[PDB]
């Protein structure tokens, strides 16, 4: 009808609870975190959305997914087939690009197929294929009355007197030749010098352009073509040269293409893969970089790191013979006695004993191959994933010197459209692109060819343009990635689909998106909508929940405090119920209060000098220690690459010795100020169901050991892994301590569904028959956290570390809750959950990426008490937010990037959320200023009553 | 609404017609061979019913689709979802089986790895897998106060003394133990003898069935399986042995199995592939049937077919050393002298000088290998794909010695159900499966797991018995059907779907099925209809009309005569409309007249003796010529493998020193009586659109010949070459002479996009200058057969080959159209055409196979003049029927095998077609009688008058 009703849902924490959501209109679902948002529109509608569908595709697919678990829920009446829009559908899988999950790349393909001119490398002539048709017709363009001369090009400069040539021309019977640019007649004594080089263009026909003159041009094309193996000139009196030849190939030198095919452009095809690297157009050879973490470290102290406990006794050697010193800081070391030590002795002899692990000398007298070729040998002859991966350690990816790293054929890199090929147009970013295109002049038959792809190719870009993502290029592999710009291209992919009738469901589409480009998102998702379809979008965002039709409020609360429907209606009406506890924060009841006052900085600074990484143009910046700072700034303008990839990097190769490769920069001062950076990442907690809160934090190692010193353990001699997870001793061995059996589903993505022999209770039955205060391990581990501190509240131990996850802005989810199945924002704050109890020095710096991410307004005030208790206690909170609630609580702020992409990567401001509001280059305190003046005057109302 | 209406389609010969179709009910096309039932149902209604939804599968979809040519109709609404089933789309591509297509082999795999018991090879004990649970709970069944002892088997029958064991069971403190059946203390001074076995088993606890016992045993279990490394043995008192091991493994030699996956029983799948033939099943190696092709040939002219002009020489040079003589019948020599000419001397060195093709003399000194080594060496070691072909002529495929056929692995068929493992039951008949299924007995889990793959395994062989198709194997290769049989198998697959609102397109599913077995045809094809589905039938069939809802007649005549809706509604309202030219037939106005007389035998005979080829009893026949001969029967009898793997192949292999391998037979004599039998194949005519009927009659070949004497060829000096399809010198560059390019279509059948160079043609602009009475060489390439022999009345070999495929029945179709489209009923028919006119000698038998195939009756008519037309003239004429309209014209019937499968092949009745319709136990008599008697009686009642 013209609205779908769902009865009776219980996916986790819902309660049995019915709800309408209206019909192709912009549905958003709103409440605090873990209220039950995901169980219902993911857990529950998209499920059944989906499922409903694809068990109609065929039989089979009835009985494999018929035969599976179905959601929980009564009945659900008014569904569509349903797509999903999240970051659980997104490839983080190599050998993908942009360009090929957008399916932009495709219709690429498709365009230099369909118009594109192949040209000869070497001669750079559009190689041209003709019938013979095609060439009399041009030779027709020209005006009654035209004249040429036919000549078929038997021999083009080639040394040899050509005697056995001109006697058979001459044996058949012609006359006229042109030999080294002067014709002369056949049967004339004709002789040429042998080591001379030669032109000779026989001339076969001589024409007046008149009626019906077709096929005497034909017979004598014919003829001429026969004659130099189907290559002919046609030389024009008062203009120039023409030469045909007939099939993809060039006059000149033989080089042929054949036909233009989608598949010759494609590097997942051996039909337009490189030869050199098989279309992956990654190397993957020794970095330099690598191998000497610091360019100054003493050598007598393994400056070089894959040489480190043979080898050092190696060196000795290598030392002794060239008269490189020990005691070194490789900084000073002439360029010589490194390039032997790093590159060989190029068949020079050294001597080299060596004393083995036994005792024993041998000496012995090897042609020494230096520190580098030895990396490369040793991974490159191994056929262990081991020893490989012990190698690759010291590798990095360079770029296929054969295809300059664009995975195609050099013949498939000859064909250009607007002067460009494949690859630099792949190579552009989308505003480059798009640019491009609009600018891009055809033909009439070219653009007439290819006005459907050109369309498709434009609306595409200016959409992936739309939802914010106009500075990455094509060409970027899609693993490199985050998640909201994953999940925000699959969106825009989505959009280029145009389908209807379909229900989507969209998580969080503002994840990573600046308010600013805000009304965009917005924009585009009615466009979706206003497509006959009907969108349900999670989301926690204010302008998000304004601008929608209808909006849903779930659950009081999270967890078993929630799972039901507070609030539904419009947003103004939602606005005007005091049930609802996201009403109060948009109609101003409750907010988020902006501080009194904010921490002056002291005299401790950082002082990142000279970054110049991606985008970032020389920059230097000065990060105030002991206080909230917020990185802020558009999305491309390079805060991953500041904040990440060159001063995290950087602080922890100098405080943890970490090997990862920095970004480029000058230097970074202020390093004694502190002795450890906890970067609190985003990324996911464990890759398989074993990892969980309870593991990752510790927990479940304490909570073991009282099952072993229980009782009836005691008296049968269980201990701390009888009741371990992973252990064969007590664990389930049909799951093999899983719990959940991972199911195979080739299209749609894998489902885990319980393990029948333990039920998913993870253990066998008699190590679930050891009991502890009435419950077992496996209910336990079933057992929320809120719930476990309560039942933990005996062992302060456990309730320290439980406490930590309850604090968090969790403790609605359970211990044993496997990691695969865990939101990033959730893991990110399980992580939080490690880091937040430890005894501070004040001399530590946090590192936060869009800490936000899945959480309430309501939430989003407990984080900012916990992270502001960290700075209380002397520690350095730096936070990467668009999220305007967190920036303006901020002691200091500091702007990126007017715009993003290359119209970026510079600062824009820094200082005090007020010093950066009043900044009128930035968007950020563009969008800042009026939530400043707007919570101030909502504080001095509540003040002056 | 409630039925599809088609507006104004013009297809190939349709007029622009209008055509409502009723929704949901047994709709039945008829008409004239060519009137453009095919044209209207599948090249119109199909099409786009396929194409509007494939279409929506995607955009790229879409994309790929909306280029290409749509059907030529205005608008067609109505439609639904459309699937066509007839050959066009059935597989003969190898590696697949019966089972694979009807998909009940897949399900075959399911139900094994669910209920499958999997045994060890050499045990033969049901291996089983274990957590301790299952374990502990089966020790409990036995009643309460039941006893026992366990016994950890540390050794099984090991010689050595175990002096190293005994020690360390009493260094850890164990004290019962069991060895050599008696059962010892430790610490009494045990010694064992070297030389003898010892069975060692440790003797862990012991104790009484009571309550609450499960952790105590739990316990000794864990410590008993600790102990023999997974293996225990539970010795009961009162009864014998139980023994666990968990995991998939054998507790007596080790071997496993892991886990039951359906994949495990798949042979495309290395996970299920025999591994010395990689799941293929066959072998290919040299039959010792093909190197001789008759057992008595003069060695000195060649009796070994593979040497036959070196060779010539070596043979003389064996034969010289071992004594054996050069002028011989084959059959007379001792078997030693074959021997070692076949099969190498075994290392002793033959002396052997040959002279070279040159003339020089060479002397060597070589170890003989023999001449099936030789081919089999040659063969193997040559990487080229033309002397691979030369040797596999010499070869035949055998069964894997490995595998014993079954393409799975030795583990794999470990795994059996009904004491019966997958291949076993694979290899069964559809009857013999079903009866194996109805008679399987099972246990409650083993049911309640598999009832809905057992019910939908029934039901699909039920299907397949349906259809007419229970005689036929799940393990029969897909290549080796017939046409009828592979589009029943379809129309079986596709009742087993239960799809509904689907548009089914049936073209003429009676083929090749008996008479008697059509009320099961139209009983199932109802019951798909009454399944909420809408079939549009192509049939000729008197019954399948007569049982129709609705029923359209199209076209007055064939070609440019037709492609008209004559009338339309049910088949008693065509039924009394004197314009249906099918109406007179079924009313009775005009039939198929039986003979006044019928051509009594003369005194020559065919004499088949001991045919025991497939299901053949040991069958001895003897066949009239100069006669009109039908060999009938229900389908299984085995009628192709008697005429055409028996007969056929011996005739020719004598006849015409053919040189396939006979059907397994003691003799056939009368083969005097012949000069050459041609068998008229139902096989396509060519495999590339480059064949087509003016190709395959050889009229093309005089067709080159006239426009290469032509005033402008002769001046253009263009040969019967020019004008030539295949030769580059006119034909269109672009299509390489094919004047369609194939469009790659994935998981679509393939589709042909006109050469937009040519825009079909064949030939270039100027080839085509080129005329012949005001039609150039495309012009008359597509003219109709018809129109054809009336534009050449000219020349008079032209025409005496054109009136040959008018004659035929066709004539309706044209000159040019590619042999990839033509029917396989058409394609016979243009075979007919070249056999049609020759000067018949008396001497020669025509074999035909259903020739009736995809026509009317009407059309039955002329091409029965025809072929006896051919008896006529002295010839004989074999005919494998169904068809009773033919079977009544026949002089003489052949019946073979009551009922199908094992049950048959063997002669039912012989004689004139009264004198079978007197024979109660032939199903074709008791079909035959009332027809006789039926249309006897219709000339009475026209003679009277
Ligand atoms: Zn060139
Ligand atoms: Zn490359
Ligand atoms: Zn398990
Ligand atoms: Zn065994
Ligand atoms: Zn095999
Ligand atoms: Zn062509």
Redesign the interface.
Known sequence: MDKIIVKGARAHNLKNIDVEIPRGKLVVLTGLSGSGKSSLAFDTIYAEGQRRYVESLS??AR?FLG?MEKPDVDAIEGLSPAISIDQKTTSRNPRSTVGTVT?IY?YLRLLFARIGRPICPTHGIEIQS????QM?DRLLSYPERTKMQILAPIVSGKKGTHAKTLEDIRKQGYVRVRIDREMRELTGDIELEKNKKHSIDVVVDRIIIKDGI??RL??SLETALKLADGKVVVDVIGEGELLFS??HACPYCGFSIGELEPRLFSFNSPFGACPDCDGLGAKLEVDLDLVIPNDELTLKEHAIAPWEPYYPQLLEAVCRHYGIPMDVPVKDLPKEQLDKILYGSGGEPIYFRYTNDFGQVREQYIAFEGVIPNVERRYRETSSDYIREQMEKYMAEQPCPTCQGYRLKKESLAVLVGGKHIGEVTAMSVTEALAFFDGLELTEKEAQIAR?ILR?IRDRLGFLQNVGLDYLTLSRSAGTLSGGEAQRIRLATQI???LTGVLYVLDEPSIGLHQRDNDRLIATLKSMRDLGNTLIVVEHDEDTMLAADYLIDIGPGAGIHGGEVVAAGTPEEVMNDPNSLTGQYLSGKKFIPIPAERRRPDGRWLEVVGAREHNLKNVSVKIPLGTFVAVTGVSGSGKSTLVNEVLYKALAQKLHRAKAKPGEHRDIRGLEHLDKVIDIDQSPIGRTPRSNPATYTGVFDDIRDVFASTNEAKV?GYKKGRFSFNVKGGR???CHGDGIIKIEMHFLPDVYVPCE?CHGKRY???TL?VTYKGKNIAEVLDMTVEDALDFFASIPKIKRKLETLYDVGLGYMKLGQPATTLSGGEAQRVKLAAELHRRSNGRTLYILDEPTTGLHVDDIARLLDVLHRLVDNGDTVLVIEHNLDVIKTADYIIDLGPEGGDRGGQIVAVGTPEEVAEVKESHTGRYLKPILERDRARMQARYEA
Chains 1, 2 share one sequence.
């Not at 003709?130 to 048709?133: F, G, M, V």
């Open positions: 039989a089979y009985q035969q399916e495709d003709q019938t013979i048709e009399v077709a096929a034909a017979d007939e099939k459907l498709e280029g689909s145009r049968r389930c061995e049909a022999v066998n039955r008699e028959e």
